[PDB]
Design a protein around this ligand. Structure first.
Ligand SMILES: NC(=O)c1ccc[n+]([C@@H]2O[C@H](COP(=O)([O-])OP(=O)(O)OC[C@H]3O[C@@H](n4cnc5c(N)ncnc54)[C@H](O)[C@@H]3O)[C@@H](O)[C@H]2O)c1
Ligand SMILES: NC(=O)c1ccc[n+]([C@@H]2O[C@H](COP(=O)([O-])OP(=O)(O)OC[C@H]3O[C@@H](n4cnc5c(N)ncnc54)[C@H](O)[C@@H]3O)[C@@H](O)[C@H]2O)c1
Ligand SMILES: NC(=O)c1ccc[n+]([C@@H]2O[C@H](COP(=O)([O-])OP(=O)(O)OC[C@H]3O[C@@H](n4cnc5c(N)ncnc54)[C@H](O)[C@@H]3O)[C@@H](O)[C@H]2O)c1
Ligand SMILES: NC(=O)c1ccc[n+]([C@@H]2O[C@H](COP(=O)([O-])OP(=O)(O)OC[C@H]3O[C@@H](n4cnc5c(N)ncnc54)[C@H](O)[C@@H]3O)[C@@H](O)[C@H]2O)c1
Lengths: 334, 338, 334, 335
């Protein structure tokens, strides 16, 4: 099996560990964080939104044991000091949020890892990958790769269909997004100086920035610069919705045409539904994006149209499933 | 001679109780009677204590036939059929119709039959009546009306924004999403829904819930010159009050900037339409009395060549923002029939 | 198979349906509620806290079809008008909340049903059953039975151990309880005139009454009148905790003695844990009561002691699992 | 006026600032935190649970201006490096959560402050004060003082009445408590290694420890060791309840006797209600404890009784009001 180390055993890190248990060919041999083994094991076992871990978890000397298999744990904030060479790490899943740059993530390579896959958008000379939209741009020689964002994984397959089938002129996005760990529990100073993420997460509708639409060109180059938009963080603990409003080249477009085009492009990454679901219904789902045909709207005044669509995503498990698909493909290629 | 306008509140719910509270601070208007489907102890308690809007500042005491507020008697009734209420005997000038069950001109006429002079419905309503957003189209009321709609919370948030966009830039078309606080028409836990809505059927405080709204689709009732040019829906989310309306538009004027849009909105600001450049969140608008609060920090202009999309957002307290507007319209409607 | 009808396809009714799919010899052939079939099918498929239904549901002519088998649906507010005789109904699961009385529940017997099991405490000359505490009191001749309450199922096995091993003098209970459908979404008049259940359910700590401790004698006769207490409804959608503070006959009681006695009494209904869990960790669990050893306290001043214990329960699934156990047992005996 | 510096402009720090605007002869001249002035001014202006600050707040050179008064701001994590001598600080209101110990808080004294009042329980040789229960124990010479906890402030006036009027044998407590900033937004490693405070704050009933009952003897010495108990953190953003179950020496006790005793002891710190309120009703209240007569229970089996009572508190504003009362009193002494 391909030997995986997880750096940052947080929401994405732990869910990635869970997902990897189901993927033949990938094995987590080590985890790194900033805490004790009792804490690591406990948070793997128990998960507020994603439910209890299926297998058995036991704290042992040097880490924890999951279903018989030992996992080595470390508590090293400086990635360059990790014993990746000694453990023969093939790929690091970088999930801390503190190495979201090619040069920063290179620390893992210096430490002895063969490759790094970052669980977030990242700057620098690297490829940004949404599985089943642009993963074929990987050839296996890459040392550092980005798995994009939760929102980009929800948006990319939708934007691709709109452009391919109708011709995208321009568009604006709003994602109604579950609150995340970069937000405060109570009103308090925020480390990034963000006066909105400073506010009590579970008691507010909170406007905030996102790169998903603005930076869509890193995943779909042919629509580079044609999208922008933002986010509204709301009091659900996981589960999100991306709404997109577009101008198209094709004219006299119908709701039926848009839905059929989306249904035709469905796969394991891009789901299609006509059920009147709500955010809790997508918790734990493994589609990167779930197109909701019930929300499609077309505004027509004369020969001028606006087309609006919406797609659900579990910002946790939807993204994690996509990240692990990319991880496996990156591993297979090399 | 001159007297305070005698108001009766039908439906002592969220809007009804907040209207009562608001009227306490508006001179020339007095609530003499309330009607609901419960006991006086319950009515007094819910007036006194309010989860989101805070403790009532007056003194509330249950008495014979109703309750006393700061020494002033309010008559209470528990009659589901509006035509049976003693509006004649009580000399009722205007009924604030806040039950959600008389949202129709013919149905709301029951209050007029009962002896009230006028009815203002706290919601969109069917029939041949006028739909009024204060400080957008209230001057369309001539005084001959007997049944009027106070529009919706969302329409009150949307209308001043849509008017500025059209007046200054020319509205071609647009789409709206309101990120809206959950309301009493939603279930506490997943359960069958009275109106058959499979989404309002779901646990209100645990979900992002898509739902329809008339605000954009029916904007033409308030701003006739943009009839049919808007559409959109709602996303109900787990805040108990406080909402946001986002509007994405195509405009006639070219090379529009964020600065131009913000300045145009600021110039249109009044007691109904507020303006902010502060990075606020939903809890910051709870209890506010603007019908709509334009958030300049959320303005975006997408340009690709000569083609532009403009996006704006305005906050509203679906409860107090709408209530303040409703009371403004109430006062004006009574003023016309001196 | 035992032919089951569910009156009231609500939280307990639907979860009972789900659990029955896992029990050979138990079959739901009919459901009665006050809504359409599309609604019933949708709420079976999608569940905010309990997750997506495993199998597949299809709306048909008579009602709905689940995994091949058809389920008939009705809309009679008066249960005596239901065609239970024609459908040869063996047991009605009474889950509406409107027939919580022996004489009221008799409506189903008049309609043609052989037995009624009410999913709540009930007034009248009937047996109140907590599975694995007093289910042996059933002989199979009963026509109307109560499955008790969620809180009683959490409390009974704990109270029994305390009395058996230490001698119960007296106690007081508080359950920190998930909000339920008998509470309002927003501050509004309450149908029962309850000024506290009138308040916004998900925004408040709300004191309220319970019959679990006061009526414990219906399940454990030897401690009748020895307990009382109440509830505090809080903003979690499901998952609850029962705390019990008692005076005991035995002296010099220790935390270890209490925990060991509870562990020794553990079974499929009564769980034991030493893990530092929280409420979300018990969502979907099938124990009727999960004793939490980390919460045990003994206060000693001279020869006088107060003993405090706590047990978790999913007021939904914990109760439902117990109700179906009692159903299967009652159906087996005659 | 007594010159106050606030260390840690957080929930308690900011509410204390607001409360000090209500107290004559007490001025906040300086604030220290770990952020910039834009953020400090914003969080003073806008408050999710406690509402908008009514006055004018503007960012100026070297801090911010509130209602015509300049507040100097700093961003220094090491308290011994603060300019307290230069600013002539009379009392530091220590609200960071990182100086809850006599010897650690001495850093403020070394920096030039005359006194320190800690906004939490604290270790070391100091007094622990619940205003209107034991503030008379202060004489004005103390250099470092603890303002106790939110829970202790809710508990002490109740426990005192129960002992004075009925004779306290023993008791156990549970506080059903709003979630606070020491809890995580999502399930995540917890800085203090608490596996329960690690969990998503607003989605769980979370058992946790509290010292309020176990350490009541610091406030009421005559009942030292007679109480214990813990907390259940629940998804309300502020507003809490303390439930206390006791054995008393007085026999044949009634609900009426207990309720009357509590009402007789009511003052500006200890309120009394017979209304069927809920947690949101106490948000922003200034009583340290609100006794709820509707929740009083007496369980009798033979001559053996268990007595249960409950008191509400806004863990934020109730505690803050008490802290500022103690602050004013401490300042008034030795003037
Ligand atoms: N919905 C989501 O939560 C979501 C979705 C997609 C992507 N992401 C991205 O994934 C990353 C992690 O997000 P998360 O929500 O899991 O955050 P998290 O806080 O839950 O996880 C981060 C973990 O990394 C650990 N950590 C921090 N610094 C470290 C260091 N220097 N060395 C080792 N461990 C360290 C922390 O202890 C924590 O456990 C972020 O970049 C985020 O943008 C999050
Ligand atoms: N955000 C908002 O809550 C909001 C905003 C704008 C408009 N509205 C509209 O205002 C109306 C009331 O909404 P609400 O949120 O206050 O609902 P609510 O449920 O809180 O209030 C309705 C009240 O009317 C009472 N009632 C029902 N039928 C009655 C009858 N036949 N006779 C007398 N009383 C009766 C109920 O007991 C209840 O107290 C609705 O039409 C709604 O669409 C609501
Ligand atoms: N935690 C819990 O939800 C829980 C736990 C244990 C016991 N219970 C008990 O179970 C019962 C149901 O609880 P619930 O939470 O599922 O309530 P619910 O409101 O979710 O379900 C009740 C269902 O019964 C239907 N109904 C009402 N009147 C009817 C009638 N006359 N005829 C046919 N159907 C009717 C309603 O449409 C609704 O779908 C109650 O007695 C409750 O006390 C609930
Ligand atoms: N319910 C309550 O929130 C409550 C009630 C009673 C007592 N307390 C106590 O009050 C204290 C603060 O609680 P809070 O809820 O306001 O916490 P908080 O997180 O909201 O505020 C703490 C503030 O101190 C700042 N800070 C941290 N380290 C610092 C340093 N070294 N130098 C300067 N500033 C620093 C932080 O940036 C933050 O703004 C804690 O000891 C807590 O136990 C809290």
């Amino acid at each position: 099996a391909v030997k995986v180390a997880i750096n940052g055993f947080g929401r994405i890190g732990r869910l990635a560990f869970r997902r990897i248990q189901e993927v033949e060919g990938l094995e987590v041999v080590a985890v790194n964080d900033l805490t004790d083994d009792d804490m690591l094991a406990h948070l793997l076992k128990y998960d507020t939104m994603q439910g209890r871990f299926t297998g058995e978890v036991e704290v042992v000397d040097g880490g924890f044991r999951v279903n018989g298999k030992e996992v080595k744990s470390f508590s090293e904030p400086d990635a360059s000091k990790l014993p990746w060479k000694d453990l023969n790490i093939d790929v690091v899943l970088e999930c801390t949020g503190f190495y979201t740059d090619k040069d920063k993530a290179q620390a893992h390579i210096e430490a002895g890892a063969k490759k790094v896959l970052i669980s977030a958008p990242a700057t620098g000379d690297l490829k940004t990958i949404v599985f089943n939209t642009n993963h074929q741009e990987l050839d296996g020689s890459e040392t550092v790769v980005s798995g994009a964002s939760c929102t980009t994984n929800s948006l990319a397959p939708v934007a691709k269909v709109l452009n391919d089938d109708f011709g995208l002129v321009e568009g604006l996005m709003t994602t109604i997004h579950a609150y995340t760990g970069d937000q405060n529990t109570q009103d308090a100073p925020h480390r990034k100086g963000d006066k909105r993420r400073a506010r009590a997460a579970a008691e507010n509708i909170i406007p905030n920035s996102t790169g998903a639409a603005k930076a869509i060109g890193k995943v779909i180059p042919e629509i580079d610069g044609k999208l922008d938009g933002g986010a509204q963080r709301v009091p659900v603990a996981t589960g999100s919705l991306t709404e997109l409003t577009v101008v198209l080249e094709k004219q006299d477009v119908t709701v039926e045409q848009v839905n059929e085009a989306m249904k035709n492009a469905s796969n394991e990454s891009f789901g299609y539904t006509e059920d009147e679901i709500v955010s809790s219904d997508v918790v734990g789902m493994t589609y990167g994006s779930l197109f909701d045909a019930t929300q499609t709207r077309v505004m027509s005044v004369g020969d001028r149209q606006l087309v609006k669509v919406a797609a659900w995503y579990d910002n946790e498990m939807s993204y994690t499933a996509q990240l692990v698909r990319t991880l496996a493909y990156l591993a297979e290629l090399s």
